[PDB]
Amino acid sequence: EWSLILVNRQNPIPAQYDVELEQLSNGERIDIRISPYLQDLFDAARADGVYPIVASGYRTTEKQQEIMDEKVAEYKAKGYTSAQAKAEAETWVAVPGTSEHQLGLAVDINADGIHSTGNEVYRWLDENSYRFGFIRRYPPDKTEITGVSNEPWHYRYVGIEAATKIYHQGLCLEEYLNTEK
């Protein structure tokens, strides 16, 4: 199924992967197929007094490289050699071609700041996102399977059916897909 595509360090985005993008009010772009589900999610959060924003949706190859390089630089400044910094940065930011952001199926969701804090939004997403087809992609108890640190902002659309099962069983996407055989 299209919404269950696996992208990670071992599963690059296919060459010639087509995505039709829609622009949100803030200029971030998403796969048009997830648009109503993301809108429903945001509508529900706001009905609960929780006010999120899409900090980052779709990214081009060059954008992903720039974000990765900026993370490498942050490590270099904290006392890592370039090689150490690259390896450490990858636990947060994927090498170009291996980010879900390049699918259009992932959004980094933050708080608006003024009505909600980060932790309020992250908590609401953790407890509710699956009802709209999104999963907390990189949970803190699955870093040894996903290869990614706790990123409570990063939500991936898989569809309501899969998201609900993933949530109830406490899985990451890799486990879910493996268990489907």
Segment near Zn ion (CB under 5 A), from 31-39, 63-71, 80-88, 146-154? Answer: 146-154
| CA separation for the pair 41, 137 (Å, rounded) | 16
Residues annotated within a binding site for Zn(2+): 101, 108, 154
Interactions with Zn ion, residue window 101-140 (CB under 5 A): 108
Q: Is 59 in the site for Zn ion (CB under 5 A)?
A: no
Instruction: Pick the binder of Zn ion from 154, 155, 156, 163 (CB under 5 A).
Output: 154
Site string for Zn ion, 22-51 (x = CB under 5 A): ------------------------------
Nearer to Zn ion, 142 or 154 (CB): 154
Nearer to Zn ion, 88 or 108 (CB): 108
CB of 108 to Zn ion, least distance (A): 4
Nearer to Zn ion, 81 or 122 (CB): 122
Select from 89, 173, 100 the least CA-distant residue to 135.
173
SS (H, E, C) the chain: CHHHCCCECCECCCCCCCCCEEECCCCCEEEHHHHHHHHHHHHHHHHCCCCEEEEECCCCHHHHHHHHHHHHHHHHHCCCCHHHHHHHHCCCCCCCCCCHHHCCCEEEEEECCCCCCHHHHHHHHHHHHHHHCEEECCCHHHHHHHCCCCCCCEEEECCHHHHHHHHHHCCCHHHHHHHCC
Residues annotated within a binding site: 64, 92-94, 99, 101, 108, 154
**Residue among 28, 90, 100, 151 flagged as catalytic:** 151
Is 151 catalytic? The answer is yes
Q: Site residues (CB under 5 A) for Zn ion? A: 108, 154
Catalytic residues, which ones? 151
